[PDB]
Symmetry: C3
Subunit: 314 residues, 3 copies
């Protein structure tokens, strides 16, 4: 199956900028080139051009509503289009807000998808529960069917229609959840593996169960949304909300490695890589590089080594 | 149950000072404030005033006997008093020597308690086996019943009466044990989980077994003595005896998270945080902060998130 | 059984030097002294004197053929000699090329030995598959019977005779394998435990299976070839090819600890410690020290503590 890289240089989902430079940093680290060398066809769609909506008045507490909604609508169109053509979409964020566009668009072509959310956060706050109107913490609230009508309509999101139910999303790496968000995941009965579960079961058992839970009765498309802050700050320091005690570089690669095994990866999001937040040039280099590794792992690169079939090396 | 923070700014249990500043650093990092925000009532008893015993002649090899004995006696009184009033005591050390006072005072009210000792060391040297008279390495030797009369009487400890048996203490994180101490833990048949066992079983199984061993037949009060050096020096660098290959920040939090689960925590010691040993300001900040996290974890803070009951967030 | 330390200050197996200083650094860190304090007799054979072969023309792509061959031949003689006298050989490299000499010499006396290869690389490239003639990446290619005659004769290795079969070597910590090398280990059906397997099973299960696979039917001599780059660069930074996501200090000691348990250790190689590659003096100190720890672990030092038998400490 061919791959379609799509850049989403957007940051209105959070206060300070920097995230819009994410895709540039990743491309500059030779993401696309390195991708080409695998058993997958690669096409770089380029970066979407986002327009700043004038006089974007804060909807109550929610900030930059119309811009984020506009951007997400434009993305969902592009995503759905490539998906329609039978390609796997790889979105380079950008902040978590863009996960609305990515998942939606993906759903229009594959309504039976499942989402595996690797993040240190749940990002399931609604316009009513947000302690800050920052939309990077609400993407999942806009997608859940069970949350339809549980919060007022936000200017710019009229086009969005809840495309997934609680029984279709699995969180991995949770370690910074708000009281409201915890009430939500508990009440709705969502399957999650926070750091304590990973500690208790080991990354192996976690993946073993997320799969039997999601791909139990019927094998369906997997949409992996990967927030770089799911790994410990010692690995991915250049992000907006780093939290200590995260997943290790090894754990991060084991996850993507098992995702490739299933052969059901349909959509991938590499979000939150903010190049201006790195304390030193090395910190940024470390962050960008680890993101690249995670992506390559998703598409065949294994740590035991690779090699072309039918070719004799001896 | 209410909480009673007690400061033990003592350091005579080891050569160089710095440890007496531990409680100041912890309070200064907002320990008490952060504690207040949980489902527990918090009362800060302040710092005990320790008097330096004049002409404290070294008892053979043991150094500062009368001072440490005096201090520990005073502490045990205070601990026992608060315990008597039905509160959970949280002692802020101070060096490991203060563990005598804390556990004793705790025992007077709850003689059926069990001690879980998270440390990189056993600290079970007796006056006869100590390679240095430093009392921070002998606390457990003064509490064990099976060691009663195995060593001469030390000036200042006449008030002490062995309160626990080998069958009531579990060590976690051992990785720097003296030949003598190893002979003692082996001969006495004490249950311990050194680093190799943690590697072999995983922190999960470790906790699972410490519990069935201790809380097997009857559920009793748990006294947690936590030496900051139980975690790797990359996490808690500001301490007297850091040893490489220790418990991770995640393993450290998993332990305390399981302790809270039992709902049997009755006494807690946060020892050995030495602010002057940090190579850089950041190193100290890291050490103090991780201690705070461990304490909050003991009292309800979970990594999956929290939230008040009866409150509707939607 | 007595121990015989043998120094192999050689570096012609790779481009830049530094590796020849490894044995000096290790001795200087008190390796031999610390060894003496265990339940093993220690004899330091000193460092072999290697002669530089004049006009060593590059055999096609392979560089420094006659020198490495000469060096390895001389080493094999010394190894075999001490082995012959019933002693355990401990070689201090030096780059991985010297693994040919060590293993061969060892086999002449114990032809039924098994090789446990802890490394981040397979080092199984043949003169035909090497992307660089550097011989530190080909040691295992010269020892495998299944690769006999699969590549031309290299000047200087006429004395070598394949001494092990694919069913006798187990790799641990693989994470930087060339396509050719992966074709080779796959086609030949070699047992390996790359980082993904370590992540999936835990170091415990890894050792549990390497043993039943190797020491299944008959207990035979174990030859442990330990490349310092098998551990994460945060532990052993001074080496030629560090790779992120390696084994931890704990995992490294757990392995050596289980090796001692079997009581079948017959030969040990501590390779690749390059003192000039350390970014700071501390980085070198860290590297050197961790190697020393690994060695001591192999010979009885346990993290739970040790103590002499028949001696009463109470
Ligand atoms: Mn996040
Ligand atoms: Mn300690
Ligand atoms: Mn290597």
């Amino acid at each position: 199956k061919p791959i379609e890289i799509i850049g989403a240089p957007f940051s209105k989902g959070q206060p300070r900028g920097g995230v819009e430079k994410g895709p540039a940093a990743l491309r500059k680290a030779g993401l696309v080139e390195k991708l080409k060398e695998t058993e997958y066809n690669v096409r770089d769609h380029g970066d979407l051009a986002f327009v700043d909506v004038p006089n974007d008045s804060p909807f109550q507490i929610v900030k930059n509503p119309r811009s984020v909604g506009k951007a997400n609508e434009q993305l969902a169109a592009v995503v759905a289009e490539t998906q329609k053509n039978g390609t796997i979409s790889v979105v380079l964020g950008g902040d978590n807000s863009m996960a609305i566009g990515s998942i939606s668009g993906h759903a229009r072509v594959h309504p039976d998808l499942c989402v595996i959310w690797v993040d240190a956060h749940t990002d399931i706050n609604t316009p009513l529960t947000t302690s800050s109107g920052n939309l990077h913490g609400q993407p999942v609230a806009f997608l859940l069917k069970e949350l339809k009508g549980k919060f007022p309509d936000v200017p710019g999101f009229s086009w969005v229609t809840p495309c997934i139910s609680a029984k279709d999303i699995v969180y991995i790496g949770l370690r910074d959840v708000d009281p409201g968000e915890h009430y939500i995941i508990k009440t709705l009965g969502i399957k999650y593996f926070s750091m304590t579960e990973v500690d208790k079961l080991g990354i192996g058992k976690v993946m073993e169960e997320t799969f039997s839970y999601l791909l139990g009765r019927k094998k369906r498309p997997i949409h992996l949304s990967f927030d770089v802050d799911g790994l410990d700050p010692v690995f991915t320091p250049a992000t907006g909300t780093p939290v200590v005690g995260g997943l290790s570089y090894r754990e991060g690669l084991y996850i993507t490695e098992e995702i490739y095994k299933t052969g059901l990866l349909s959509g991938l999001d590499i979000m939150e890589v903010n190049p201006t937040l790195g304390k030193t040039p090395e910190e940024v280099t470390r962050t960008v590089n680890t993101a690249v590794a995670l992506t390559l792992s998703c598409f065949g690169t294994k740590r035991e080594g690779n090699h072309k079939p039918e070719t004799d090396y001896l």
